Design an enzyme around this catalytic site. Structure first.
Site, mmCIF file in Angstrom:
data_model
loop_
_atom_site.group_PDB
_atom_site.id
_atom_site.type_symbol
_atom_site.label_atom_id
_atom_site.label_comp_id
_atom_site.label_asym_id
_atom_site.label_seq_id
_atom_site.Cartn_x
_atom_site.Cartn_y
_atom_site.Cartn_z
ATOM 1 N N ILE A 157 19.955 -6.259 -7.643
ATOM 2 C CA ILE A 157 19.526 -4.868 -7.752
ATOM 3 C C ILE A 157 18.475 -4.616 -6.689
ATOM 4 O O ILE A 157 17.347 -5.089 -6.799
ATOM 5 C CB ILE A 157 18.928 -4.555 -9.148
ATOM 6 C CG1 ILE A 157 20.014 -4.672 -10.220
ATOM 7 C CG2 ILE A 157 18.325 -3.143 -9.166
ATOM 8 C CD1 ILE A 157 19.510 -4.843 -11.635
ATOM 9 N N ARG A 202 8.904 -6.156 -9.665
ATOM 10 C CA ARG A 202 7.756 -5.533 -10.346
ATOM 11 C C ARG A 202 7.928 -5.586 -11.845
ATOM 12 O O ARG A 202 9.019 -5.378 -12.353
ATOM 13 C CB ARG A 202 7.566 -4.077 -9.898
ATOM 14 C CG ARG A 202 6.875 -3.928 -8.544
ATOM 15 C CD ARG A 202 5.418 -4.354 -8.658
ATOM 16 N NE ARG A 202 4.652 -4.288 -7.418
ATOM 17 C CZ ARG A 202 4.483 -5.310 -6.572
ATOM 18 N NH1 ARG A 202 5.059 -6.501 -6.774
ATOM 19 N NH2 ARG A 202 3.737 -5.136 -5.510
ATOM 20 N N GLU A 214 -0.443 -7.603 -16.086
ATOM 21 C CA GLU A 214 -0.898 -8.807 -15.391
ATOM 22 C C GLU A 214 -2.444 -8.862 -15.422
ATOM 23 O O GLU A 214 -3.102 -7.839 -15.294
ATOM 24 C CB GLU A 214 -0.367 -8.810 -13.945
ATOM 25 C CG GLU A 214 1.120 -9.171 -13.818
ATOM 26 C CD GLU A 214 1.727 -8.916 -12.418
ATOM 27 O OE1 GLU A 214 0.997 -8.862 -11.404
ATOM 28 O OE2 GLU A 214 2.958 -8.748 -12.319
ATOM 29 N N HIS A 240 2.458 -14.019 -10.505
ATOM 30 C CA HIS A 240 2.616 -13.221 -9.304
ATOM 31 C C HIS A 240 2.357 -14.041 -8.015
ATOM 32 O O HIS A 240 1.549 -13.643 -7.178
ATOM 33 C CB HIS A 240 1.692 -12.015 -9.399
ATOM 34 C CG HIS A 240 2.191 -10.813 -8.660
ATOM 35 N ND1 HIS A 240 2.240 -9.563 -9.229
ATOM 36 C CD2 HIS A 240 2.683 -10.673 -7.405
ATOM 37 C CE1 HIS A 240 2.721 -8.699 -8.354
ATOM 38 N NE2 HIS A 240 2.992 -9.347 -7.236
HETATM 39 N N1 LIG Z 1 6.425 -11.251 -6.495
HETATM 40 C C1 LIG Z 1 5.958 -11.043 -5.267
HETATM 41 O O1 LIG Z 1 5.028 -11.697 -4.843
HETATM 42 C C2 LIG Z 1 6.614 -10.029 -4.370
HETATM 43 C C3 LIG Z 1 6.687 -10.248 -3.000
HETATM 44 C C4 LIG Z 1 7.318 -9.319 -2.187
HETATM 45 C C5 LIG Z 1 7.861 -8.176 -2.758
HETATM 46 N N2 LIG Z 1 7.771 -7.981 -4.080
HETATM 47 C C6 LIG Z 1 8.351 -6.779 -4.668
HETATM 48 O O2 LIG Z 1 9.764 -6.779 -4.496
HETATM 49 C C7 LIG Z 1 10.207 -5.523 -3.998
HETATM 50 C C8 LIG Z 1 11.312 -5.781 -2.987
HETATM 51 O O3 LIG Z 1 10.729 -6.155 -1.753
HETATM 52 P P1 LIG Z 1 11.391 -5.722 -0.371
HETATM 53 O O4 LIG Z 1 10.447 -6.178 0.716
HETATM 54 O O5 LIG Z 1 12.823 -6.186 -0.364
HETATM 55 O O6 LIG Z 1 11.362 -4.126 -0.467
HETATM 56 P P2 LIG Z 1 12.320 -3.224 0.444
HETATM 57 O O7 LIG Z 1 11.719 -1.843 0.522
HETATM 58 O O8 LIG Z 1 12.595 -3.973 1.719
HETATM 59 O O9 LIG Z 1 13.681 -3.110 -0.382
HETATM 60 C C9 LIG Z 1 13.713 -2.483 -1.648
HETATM 61 C C10 LIG Z 1 15.111 -1.951 -1.896
HETATM 62 O O10 LIG Z 1 15.242 -1.534 -3.261
HETATM 63 C C11 LIG Z 1 16.078 -0.378 -3.275
HETATM 64 N N3 LIG Z 1 15.901 0.361 -4.541
HETATM 65 C C12 LIG Z 1 14.897 1.180 -4.882
HETATM 66 N N4 LIG Z 1 15.065 1.625 -6.152
HETATM 67 C C13 LIG Z 1 16.195 1.095 -6.630
HETATM 68 C C14 LIG Z 1 16.960 1.163 -7.891
HETATM 69 N N5 LIG Z 1 16.537 1.925 -8.923
HETATM 70 N N6 LIG Z 1 18.087 0.421 -7.993
HETATM 71 C C15 LIG Z 1 18.521 -0.341 -6.969
HETATM 72 N N7 LIG Z 1 17.879 -0.444 -5.790
HETATM 73 C C16 LIG Z 1 16.729 0.240 -5.570
HETATM 74 C C17 LIG Z 1 15.717 0.377 -2.011
HETATM 75 O O11 LIG Z 1 16.800 1.196 -1.568
HETATM 76 C C18 LIG Z 1 15.447 -0.749 -1.032
HETATM 77 O O12 LIG Z 1 16.617 -1.027 -0.243
HETATM 78 C C19 LIG Z 1 8.990 -4.825 -3.404
HETATM 79 O O13 LIG Z 1 8.903 -3.436 -3.729
HETATM 80 C C20 LIG Z 1 7.800 -5.542 -3.997
HETATM 81 O O14 LIG Z 1 7.148 -4.779 -5.018
HETATM 82 C C21 LIG Z 1 7.180 -8.877 -4.885
HETATM 83 C C1 LIG Z 2 -0.717 -10.228 -1.463
HETATM 84 S S1 LIG Z 2 -0.163 -9.672 -3.047
HETATM 85 C C2 LIG Z 2 1.385 -8.917 -2.760
HETATM 86 C C3 LIG Z 2 2.434 -9.259 -3.735
HETATM 87 C C4 LIG Z 2 3.497 -8.271 -4.003
HETATM 88 O O1 LIG Z 2 4.068 -8.311 -5.056
HETATM 89 C C5 LIG Z 2 3.898 -7.256 -3.011
HETATM 90 O O2 LIG Z 2 3.193 -7.048 -1.989
HETATM 91 O O3 LIG Z 2 4.954 -6.608 -3.185
#
Ligand SMILES: NC(=O)c1ccc[n+]([C@@H]2O[C@H](COP(=O)([O-])OP(=O)(O)OC[C@H]3O[C@@H](n4cnc5c(N)ncnc54)[C@H](O)[C@@H]3O)[C@@H](O)[C@H]2O)c1
Ligand SMILES: CSCCC(=O)C(=O)O
Ligand SMILES: NC(=O)c1ccc[n+]([C@@H]2O[C@H](COP(=O)([O-])OP(=O)(O)OC[C@H]3O[C@@H](n4cnc5c(N)ncnc54)[C@H](O)[C@@H]3O)[C@@H](O)[C@H]2O)c1
Ligand SMILES: CSCCC(=O)C(=O)O
Lengths: 327, 327
Positions: A154, A240, A269, A289
């Site tokens: 997703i 998230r 969190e 996280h």
């Molecule tokens: N746990 C962590 O440490 C960590 C690290 C990096 C990113 N993240 C989270 O993961 C997410 C993904 O990262 P990314 O760099 O790939 O972001 P990104 O913006 O590169 O990609 C996100 C994608 O999700 C799609 N999207 C939005 N809403 C949607 C829905 N309801 N259903 C399906 N698709 C949907 C968007 O079209 C986009 O292509 C980020 O928003 C960030 O919050 C968490």
């Molecule tokens: C350096 S904390 C960032 C972790 C995260 O979930 C994000 O940036 O999407």
């Protein structure tokens, strides 16, 4: 020199050499806006922040000089971005520093569910003795063969794409659902795309979340949608915490409707195994996280963030910015 | 009908439909030869077995009618194979049923060392609260970026190859050392090969074992060779416990010379965190010889083993056998 405040942290050592001759740097070590000194609210021209503090419109109005917020990291759901822009505040992020870290932690979680390594390790710590094959089969019960299984992604942005490519190498059949991409990316990367969330959940043996948290996807996984997932499906979330209703997830784990879940992120969190809806849920792996974290990624995003602040101050908002997400 | 005995187990339910009209099937649930009934030693024409019992020449001589041993699984270091052949006993294995299970568990272990998921989970179970970024960096300290790291594979047979292909997808640079393969396989699969163990250990950030245990590689990893590994290297072992000197490994973990190790196999099995040289070692992940296990792999190898017995009895030793490893 303009004031720049690190809001939800103390350490500024990485940003300092980049910002020295450009900004006065302060930190607030704040969990919330009620913990920021009046000087910062009054004078701060820029702000650096992580994910551990939220800025609502209320909070943003308390700033009287603030022209730029830079997230150190990619997700910006914790900032009310539209209000910030109305209030004349440029918000940026750091999109690229931890993509592969996060994909790799994601794969680690997936594999941990399928191969039970973390649980088997726990078992051994608990003093379970596994002498016979029969005992191996029992302690490892639920461990499954991956080839031919379907991974449903997703959100197929940066992380989802890195995840998909890795997953092909284990013989997963990869589907994705992403309602905002134009068509053809599925062809470019050799994946199967589905039109609806329900199609994804119906066909997926393991479901993994890689979308931003936005106004339209709170509790994307909930009592209703959980019921659409395959019986005994796995769920993985390194995106998230707000995309999942932990109350529905918990019940689902208890009843065995979801066989296992791996979570790096959570509705509230820091996460505890002693507090919240997940308290008693079986078959749950969790991390604090930390999917993003490596020393290189940490350093990388901090330096890029610092530079973005520098570009804000030295040049023209929003033209001089590389990663403003509310122009 | 000839007697066939399952030596180190009880359950024969999978083998029974294949062997019904061909052999009388018995089990011994034996941890050792001193636990097998005289009837079995006297009359057994075939034997089915796992890894939890060893057959030395002594043990093999106690059998007066035995014409075939079939291992249910791939590793046969636990049988003195050369003596068996001298004594006129055909030994077979089941080489292919769990290759990808094992590769996937191996990748799970590698990723667990690099991304610390298992340890981070433990940490959360222990009640560590991880509120701030600073705290995330501390609890996850040691978590590392994989791209550009070097994975050194010792033994590039079925599992090592499946491991290599998976590892490329995470951006590992993959080296291998396998002194028994003819040249060119490195080209076929796009890998770098090195001539000596020492070359492998010198250049590798993570070292992973995928060779059979044989007369020439007991304690392959020992006081001497451990000293050749990179400072702060990881070690992974899903091959055989006897390839590693746990005394040297332990010291190395204590001193930090090896940053972490993941072990599915051990010198003395079953493994306990309360007994043996590893007792106090930090940075240790362990699993109870379960890398092989999935329900499909278990069933698959049991049916293939049963058929091999059937082929032994019905036809001509060693011609009728698919997987005799001492012809
Ligand atoms: N746990 C962590 O440490 C960590 C690290 C990096 C990113 N993240 C989270 O993961 C997410 C993904 O990262 P990314 O760099 O790939 O972001 P990104 O913006 O590169 O990609 C996100 C994608 O999700 C799609 N999207 C939005 N809403 C949607 C829905 N309801 N259903 C399906 N698709 C949907 C968007 O079209 C986009 O292509 C980020 O928003 C960030 O919050 C968490
Ligand atoms: C350096 S904390 C960032 C972790 C995260 O979930 C994000 O940036 O999407
Ligand atoms: N943990 C588990 O559940 C599990 C599952 C499957 C296999 N195994 C073990 O892992 C081993 C590997 O499995 P496989 O199916 O790939 O076996 P394989 O016979 O297909 O390959 C083994 C390779 O190791 C090489 N080799 C032998 N001695 C060596 C040495 N000293 N240095 C370097 N290379 C050497 C051989 O040339 C061969 O190519 C098996 O022998 C088995 O004992 C464990
Ligand atoms: C069915 S137990 C087999 C496990 C193993 O290590 C092997 O066969 O090599």
């Amino acid at each position: 020199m303009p004031l720049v405040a690190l809001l939800d942290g103390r350490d500024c050592t990485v940003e300092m050499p980049i910002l020295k001759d450009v900004a006065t740097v302060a930190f607030c070590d704040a969990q919330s806006t009620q913990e920021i000194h009046e000087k910062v609210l009054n004078e701060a021209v820029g702000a650096l922040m992580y994910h551990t503090i939220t800025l609502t419109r209320e909070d943003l109005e308390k700033f009287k000089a603030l022209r730029i917020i830079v997230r150190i990291g990619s997700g910006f759901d914790n900032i009310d971005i539209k209000s910030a822009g109305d209030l004349g505040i440029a918000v940026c992020n750091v999109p690229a520093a931890s993509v592969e870290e996060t994909a790799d932690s994601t794969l680690c979680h997936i594999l941990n569910l399928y191969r039970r390594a973390t649980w088997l390790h726990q078992a051994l710590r608990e003093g379970t003795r596994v002498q016979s094959v029969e005992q191996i089969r029992e302690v490892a019960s639920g461990a499954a063969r991956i080839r031919g299984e379907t991974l449903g992604i997703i959100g197929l942005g940066r992380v989802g794409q890195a995840v998909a490519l890795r997953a092909k190498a284990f013989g997963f059949n990869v589907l994705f659902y992403d309602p905002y991409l134009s068509d053809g990316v599925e062809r470019a990367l050799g994946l199967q795309r589905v039109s609806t969330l329900q199609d994804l959940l119906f066909h997926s043996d393991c479901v993994t979340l890689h979308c931003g948290l936005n106004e339209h996807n709170h509790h994307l996984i909930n009592d209703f949608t959980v019921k659409q997932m395959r019986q005994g499906a796995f769920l993985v979330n390194t995106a998230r915490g707000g995309l999942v209703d932990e109350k529905a997830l918990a019940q689902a784990l208890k009843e065995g409707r979801i066989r296992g879940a791996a979570l790096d992120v959570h509705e509230s969190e820091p996460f505890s195994f002693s507090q919240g809806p997940l308290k008693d849920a079986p078959n749950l792996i969790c991390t604090p996280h930390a999917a993003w974290y490596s020393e290189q990624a940490s350093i990388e995003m901090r330096e890029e963030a610092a530079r973005e602040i520098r570009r804000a101050i030295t040049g023209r908002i929003p033209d001089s910015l590389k990663n403003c997400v509310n122009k």
